Design a protein around this ligand. Structure first.
Ligand SMILES: CCn1c(CO)nn(-c2nc(O[C@@H](C)C(F)(F)F)c(C(=O)Nc3c(F)cccc3Cl)cc2F)c1=O
Ligand SMILES: Cc1cc2nc3c(=O)[nH]c(=O)nc-3n(C[C@H](O)[C@H](O)[C@H](O)COP(=O)(O)O)c2cc1C
Ligand SMILES: O=C(O)c1cc(=O)[nH]c(=O)[nH]1
Length: 355
């Protein structure tokens, strides 16, 4: 471990988080990153998936940069790809404060932001302003994803996601649609994803993004079977596994454990990993998976890759370790690939299923 990794984890992050409320910490992080106020990837880390080169498999998950304000800084931090959003059609404020809660004893966060968004038009103009720079970044193995949401008052989710495809699809390497429990159904999911794909296929080939579906871990076995079936039937390009959990695993110690919202970080890790394992098996290893939930080490990343993830993302680990976590995960992942006899990340994808 480096000097910076230890300093940030043991001293700087605990001090800054002790002085700030959690939402102020988030806003300041976005501002610092956007300005590049921050501290070489080996070829073993390169992955080719989703019609693109990824110079490393470690991405920033949706939620950190909801409004596309810090994309270039996130690449400077060392992420192999960036996902912005969720972005809603119209601007909206989200839920009343307080809406973000730290559980330091669990290395977890709970949030109920409620899709606070600057809206598609603002994000469109922000991305347009750097679109050629992004085209070069993407060519150099640093792709951009855009996560689409829906407005609170919308009657038809398909219309909101269609609007997002039309407006931000031409500026993205991939798009993400979040899907909730269809049975608490399948025909409605099929309808939704059919419209998204028809809208996507309407874009000029040079600006035609991949489409991924992001799922929560709070799905029945029937929900997961139904999602896998629809994804294969329609030719959805990939899955993001997983969002935050509305469950509260036994053993949480944080005083704020009973706050409403989505739980992220370490308590989500193995729930996420098990969901990757299930979705990889249900899609016969033919649908790329981005693995997300509780990643803070090379071991955590490798467990998701071996379970079936082609790429991984993190967010919550940044809140505890700061920017040095990105280099930590990458260095540890490279070391573990070498220790286990893999030629690169590619050879490890789904390796637990071929035992
Ligand atoms: C879930 C909301 N949430 C929380 C609360 O739960 N924390 N948090 C983050 N806070 C961060 O730093 C805070 C403390 C700051 F005040 F220093 F900005 C950072 C971070 O990387 N900061 C940072 C940087 F961006 C550039 C150079 C040095 C540093 Cl230390 C990343 C985060 F995800 C965040 O999004
Ligand atoms: C504060 C916060 C905001 C989030 N906002 C979004 C969002 O807008 N859209 C989305 O798909 N996921 C969102 N997520 C979920 C993350 O993208 C990720 O799936 C989840 O937090 C698990 O990863 P982690 O344990 O590494 O944080 C958010 C997470 C947090 C903690
Ligand atoms: O904005 C939010 O509340 C939010 C969205 C999402 O997809 N996941 C999450 O944990 N929070």
């Amino acid at each position: 471990a480096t000097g910076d990794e230890r300093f940030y984890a043991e001293h700087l992050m605990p001090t800054l988080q002790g002085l700030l409320d959690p939402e102020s910490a988030h806003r300041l992080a976005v501002r610092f990153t956007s300005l590049g106020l921050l501290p070489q990837d080996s070829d073993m880390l390169e992955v080719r998936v989703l019609g693109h080169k990824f110079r490393n498999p470690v991405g920033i998950a949706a939620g950190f940069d909801k409004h596309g304000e810090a994309v270039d800084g996130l690449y400077k931090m060392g992420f192999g790809f960036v996902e912005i959003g969720s972005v809603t059609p119209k601007p909206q404020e989200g839920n009343p404060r307080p809406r973000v809660f730290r559980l330091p004893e669990d290395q977890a966060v709970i949030n109920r932001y409620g899709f606070n968004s600057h809206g598609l038009s603002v994000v469109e103009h922000r991305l347009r302003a750097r679109q050629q720079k992004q085209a070069k970044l993407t060519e150099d193995g640093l792709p951009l994803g855009v996560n689409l949401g829906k407005n609170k008052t919308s009657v038809d989710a398909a219309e909101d996601y269609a609007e997002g495809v039309r407006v931000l699809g031409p500026l993205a390497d991939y798009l993400v649609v979040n899907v909730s429990s269809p049975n608490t159904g399948k025909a409605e999911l099929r309808r939704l994803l059919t419209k998204v794909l028809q809208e996507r296929d309407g874009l000029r080939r040079v600006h035609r993004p991949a489409v991924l579906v992001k799922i929560a871990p709070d799905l029945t076995s029937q929900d997961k079977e139904d999602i896998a079936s629809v994804v294969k039937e329609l030719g959805i390009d990939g899955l993001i596994v997983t969002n935050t959990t509305v469950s509260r695993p036994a053993g949480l110690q944080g005083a704020l454990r009973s706050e409403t919202g989505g739980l992220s970080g370490k308590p989500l890790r193995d729930l996420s990993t098990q969901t990757i394992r299930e979705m990889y098996a249900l899609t016969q290893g033919r649908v790329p998976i981005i693995g997300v939930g509780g990643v803070s080490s090379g071991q955590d990343a490798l467990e998701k890759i071996r379970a079936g993830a082609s790429l991984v993302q993190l967010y919550t680990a940044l809140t505890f370790w700061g920017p040095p976590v990105v280099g930590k995960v990458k260095r540890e992942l490279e070391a573990l690939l070498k220790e286990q006899g893999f030629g690169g990340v590619t050879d490890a994808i789904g390796a637990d299923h071929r035992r």
